[PDB]
Amino acid sequence: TFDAPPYVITPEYILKKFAGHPPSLIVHLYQNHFRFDQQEGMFQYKSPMRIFIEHLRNRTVPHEIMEYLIQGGVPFYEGCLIVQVFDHRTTVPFSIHNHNPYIPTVYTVVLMPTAQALHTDLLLKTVTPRDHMELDPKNIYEVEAKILLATYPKLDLEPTKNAEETIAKLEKLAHPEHSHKPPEPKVRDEALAAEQERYMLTLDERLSSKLWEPRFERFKLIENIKQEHAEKKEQE
Amino acid sequence: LIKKCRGHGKGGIPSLSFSAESNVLVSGGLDCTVRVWDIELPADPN
Amino acid sequence: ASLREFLNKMDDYAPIIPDAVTNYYMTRAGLPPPPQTDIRLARLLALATQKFIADIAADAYQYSRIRALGIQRPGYGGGGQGGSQNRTVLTMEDLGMAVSEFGVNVKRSEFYR
Amino acid sequence: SPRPRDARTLELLLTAQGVTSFEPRVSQLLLDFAYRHTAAVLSDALHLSSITANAVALAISSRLGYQFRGGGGGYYGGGGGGASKDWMLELARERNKVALPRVLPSEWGVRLPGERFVLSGVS
Amino acid sequence: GPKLLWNPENVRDVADALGITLSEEPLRLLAQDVEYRIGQVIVESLRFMRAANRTTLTVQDVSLALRVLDVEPLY
Amino acid sequence: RTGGIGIPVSACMFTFHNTLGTVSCMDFSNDHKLVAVGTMDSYIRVWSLDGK
């Protein structure tokens, strides 16, 4: 048997119930990029991983990278994630004339589960070898059913006698995550210096195109090749 | 599942209805029959 | 050529389609019959249908006539002894040839085995 | 009376599926549909070419781009239009995020949509 | 492949009408596809029939089934 | 409830004639005053159940 979550899950309940445990994730934010605590590189805010930041804004679980979370053994607390955020946001370049001798704030937040997360979990289990796979597709629905029984053990089944009682019940059972307003409609001198600069960049292979995310792929490939060759040599 | 009720033929049961106290059920079938069902049988008097 | 004058001249332009057929198919499509709809609008719709059918007849008569080596086109099985006398017979081949220009396919199998 | 084979077969198959009666002109409709489908598919396969099995498969795949988006497919089966389930899930997420409309007891059952969306002045 | 309910001789006749010569593998493939399409049509027709609370199948149900699948109508 | 049998029930049947298999759906109003049938011919027909 397991304890079911409340009807409305709030950061206070999770942060009070799960005190003394390590956080699920730690992220550092910089002026133009962010990283994780044990990461070596960086992620730019204009990169695809921007998606993660959006989840941090909406307090939602990032299902689109769920596999990567399962591989790393990220802990869950009643299906939510505890995230700590560290905030560090708050001459004559390329001139030979230059001289040279050798010439944070802390926040804690909670991300809540969604239905897409459960769909992703079941889909991933369907293709994860352990029967062959961990879950057989023909048994998916049954499994799902059981999970629901453990998430909503109690329902409001008492009937109403008139429309006023239904109105009161709809008022009483409102959920913050489904209480937003409808969205907004879709909407649609230096010239001489710029012209001179453009003229002076004529027939430039790379600089002209611009008028930058380093991933170090080649170096990682070289390191992998060197490791493999060293391992092969050690065998002999 | 609480239980199963059998006796209708094959083809489809398009309509069901409960009584005011929900202790009886009425069903209509495409086999040209109307049937009445007890939702809880009485205790055995021994 | 105004629409008002044409609708006012609808007495002389009534088609050969009976009113019952018009009402039945208008109801099937979703338009209440001429008791509530104007009779002239229903007459106009029936006249358009008659014109369309007459077009599809004039073609397929052209096709039958230009047809008068020498084997039938597969996919138009039909007929019996082939009629009698030098008479023009409306056959599946000519109708299919004509209605292919309107975007309709009427191909069948000749035998079934 | 004479009757072609595959017609008795289609009718027996229909009976085995729980159909207690059918009109006489269903079997020949199905046979002619099969004729048309075969002719179209192999006429397509002829142009992509002796015809091989790869040409037939490619013709079928090409035809599957604009028709036959139905059937009784289940988990990740292309039925009901062929829409992906994740796309539908995100559309539902966008829709179900708005609060339910506020209705007073005096307008429950009598209020309608705006004038732009109702049938006024249509006669 | 599997065992087919549809006879490949029908496909051979159709190819005869158009002057085409077929081998065995494409013939079996085309027969299998024709069988699968017939099954799809039957499924949709039965769906439409049951939506109307009936046990009798009419030409209208088959026509609606062909319309929903984006198939050229028969007349 | 110990012993005995179920409950007696009465039934009233309404039958429709000359439909020729065109009727798809049927419904009764909340007070058993009206009946509506939808057909395969695209139209709906409503009747008062007492002939008024």
Place this chain on the structure above:
Amino acid sequence: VDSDEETAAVMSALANWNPQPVVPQPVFAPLKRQYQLARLHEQLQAATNGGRTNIFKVVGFG
């Protein structure tokens, strides 16, 4: 040839019919999602070195 057995066998075989397709039925979605997910997978594979590095690991208690 017993007729009752033949009828039973034929009807039982016809009742369990289930044809198999030659090619699978396509599933449709917008192009934008496909491109975005492909890009995200490329970036994450580059970051994790193909799964040899755990960047989500947490050391300590926060």
Place this chain on the structure above:
Amino acid sequence: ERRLKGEVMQLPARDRRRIKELAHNDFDPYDALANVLMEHALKMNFDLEIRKRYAQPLAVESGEFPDTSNIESRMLPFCYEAGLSSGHAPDAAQFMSIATETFIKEVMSAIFSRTRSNGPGDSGSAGFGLGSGWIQTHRYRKQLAKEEEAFQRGEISRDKMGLLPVEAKAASERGPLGMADVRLALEMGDCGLAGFPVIVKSVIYGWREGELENWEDYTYVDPSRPDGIAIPSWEGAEPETSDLLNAVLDSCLA
């Protein structure tokens, strides 16, 4: 059940054998889903070249109609996917761009012709020529004929774009194409989008035009009206720092 025996025994033995052999089919493991499921859950390194398809923005992302350069960038990964190791002919990208422009023009023309009327006449150099045109109303036809004759007599002059006063007046009253027109046109036919179900389903499932702006626009049921309708005339815990964190995150997202 005595008629089923006759029906079954009217089939010849070959057909009965063929039907009975269906029982040998090894059911439906439907293992082929796996690939589909995977789709959702000396030598030349062709994968490196193929992975270049996702390094260019889409037309919807950049707001630019595709041209020869973009199509050329797209072609090569497709060729390497299919095993075409010699690439493409030099003249294929221009052909593709012309075809794309033709397709878009056809779609837009089909949509426009079902929702517009009173276009310019064939007096000269402006109009639909020998293509498909729009409908006209009686008053517009009368005025257009009168003005064409007047211009032929030399009493009228066109504007800088070559329109007559009636044509320019009619044109000025038209507006930009909206989603209501698209929805109406899709109810008349495919419009050339039979092979693009996602676009159609996106149009059908969306909000109605003008619906989000007038959220509180209501009418009422009134049986005494002409139509029955009345028109009214831990550190930094979340709850205590969520706003500050939201401000920082909004700055990051920009």
